[PDB]
Structures are given as structure tokens and as C-alpha cells.
């Protein structure tokens, strides 16, 4: 029942933003708050932050901050995350995640992630 849809792939070069979407479907997009991981060939999971769609509410891994941007748009059930200034170390597919609450950043269901390459 539940999916959450995230937004193609792209490529890009250094110093440009991209924006990207996750798109929930199957349950009640207030009710649960949604994370965003990232994730290199050469690393684990990484969180980055999640954002509360109830309230707009938002907290951030300290790394991101000023990096990532995340928000929410309830009426299309759809989070969106904006990546500033991009390298080479950006570079890596990125994953919404629905936060399980309760408990903790527990993650029970993942989107298909996006792959963002930074070229040349």
C-alpha cells in the first residue's frame, strides 16, 4: 500500500543546485515525518536530516546544514529536497525514508532512491 516515489537521476556540474521530490502514496503524509539518507558506493547510510510535515517541523545532520534543504508540500503529499552548490563529494544516491514513529530514525519504508553525478 505504501510507496514513496522519488524524482529521476541527474547530472550536473559543480556549483549547481538540484531539487529533488519524494512522493508519498498509500498513507497519511502528516502522520509520519520523512527522512533523507545519502548514500555512497564507498560508505553506509548517511543521514541528513527529516522533515515533520505536520508542522513544517525540520532537524538536521550538522554537516547538512546550509547543504541540504528540506520541505514539504502536504496538499500533494510530495517532500522535496534542494542540494546547494554541489562537488564531486555530493555525488552519491540519495533515499527518502519514512520515519517509523515510534521509535527513533528507525526507517520502515524507502523510496527507490535518486542517483545525482557531479561531471565533469
Known amino acids: 500500500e505504501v ?3 522519488q524524482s529521476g537521476p541527474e547530472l550536473v556540474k559543480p556549483g549547481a543546485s538540484v531539487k529533488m521530490s519524494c512522493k508519498a502514496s498509500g498513507y497519511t503524509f502528516t502522520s509520519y515525518v520523512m527522512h533523507w539518507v545519502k ?3 564507498g560508505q553506509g547510510l548517511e543521514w541528513i536530516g527529516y522533515i515533520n510535515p505536520y508542522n513544517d517541523g525540520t532537524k538536521y545532520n550538522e554537516k547538512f546544514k546550509g547543504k541540504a534543504t ?3 508540500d502536504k ?3 510530495t517532500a522535496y529536497m534542494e542540494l546547494s552548490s554541489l562537488t564531486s563529494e555530493d555525488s552519491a544516491v540519495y533515499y527518502c525514508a519514512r520515519g517509523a514513529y515510534k521509535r527513533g530514525y528507525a526507517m520502515d519504508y524507502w523510496g527507490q532512491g535518486t542517483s545525482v553525478t557531479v561531471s565533469s
Open 39 to 41: 548514500q555512497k558506493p
Open 70 to 72: 528540506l520541505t514539504s
Open 75 to 77: 496538499s500533494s503529499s
Open 3 to 5: 510507496q514513496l516515489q
